[PDB]
């Protein structure tokens, strides 16, 4: 399972929160027909706060809302992600075979997280008091259900720089879901992984920062952003698989840069070549960044131009990826 609160963040608030918040952030710890191109098919459960999977059907393809924005959020921004993969990429769901999109709601009692199971999306409430219900921001939502789009191509392995390229990518496809939705070109998009999600009272705009890795949070129970903005200040660390999380914002910032280099609309360039390349039947299982971002720029050469992957090249080596 991958899971969008990594196990440090949650440990913090154990050691920092209330004890209401302490108990339902180590309850979340220690936890254990297919579509034609471009017509999605969703299924939409009702967990009813147990953690049996996948719950009471709900809302199904076509079927009318419940009135209950939990499903409503589910059903509408499981919509949108295969809007986007279809519109910008030709692409029919997340391994291109038409896949059911399936999610359950209201999972467990005051769940502080939401994962990608390998066949379908999961949701927790949150408590109110950090973190918000979890189908409650679009890119978050994105974020988890292109972890399918990873394992269905190049599949990277989850440790270290592969890891954190695969964390990397479900961050960009997030982030472009939500600026397709809104029709926001690169010098308008926020670039936040997490807007809205932290409860209100907390210090921080959301979990990351795709421009300004390290920026994102500073509060006393949630602790300070630890990401580094470039290879210069890698973390060289066996936690957290090997720093997945912690290493991310790297590659992020190289994605806002070329983006931002480019103008336009953030998919119809940047994004092609990060699709390009993660479909790249020469790019292994166990990539680097160094070898990652040399395949972006063949990518880059290959679909456009040598002015565009100049361009490229160039927010890879300002982020210390040579
Ligand atoms: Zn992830």
Known sequence: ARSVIPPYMLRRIIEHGSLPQRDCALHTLNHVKTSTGGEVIRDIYDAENSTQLPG?????????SNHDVAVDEAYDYLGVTYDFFWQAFKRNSLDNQGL?????????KEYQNAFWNGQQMVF???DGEIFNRFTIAIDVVGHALA????????????????????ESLSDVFGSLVKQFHLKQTADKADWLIGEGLLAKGINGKGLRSMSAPGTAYDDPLLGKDPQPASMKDYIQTKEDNGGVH??????????????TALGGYAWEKAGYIWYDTLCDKAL???????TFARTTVKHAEQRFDSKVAQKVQQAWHQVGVA
């Open 147 to 166: 972890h399918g789009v990873t394992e269905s191509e190049a599949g990277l392995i989850y440790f270290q720089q592969a890891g954190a390229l695969n």
């Open 56 to 64: 009471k059907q709900v809302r199904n393809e076509g079927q009318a």
């Open 100 to 108: 059911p999109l399936t999610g359950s709601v209201h999972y467990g």
């Open 284 to 290: 292994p299982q166990d990539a680097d960044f160094a």
């Open 246 to 259: 912690l290493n991310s914002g790297i590659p992020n910032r190289a994605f806002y840069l070329a983006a």
């Open 124 to 126: 927790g409430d949150g």
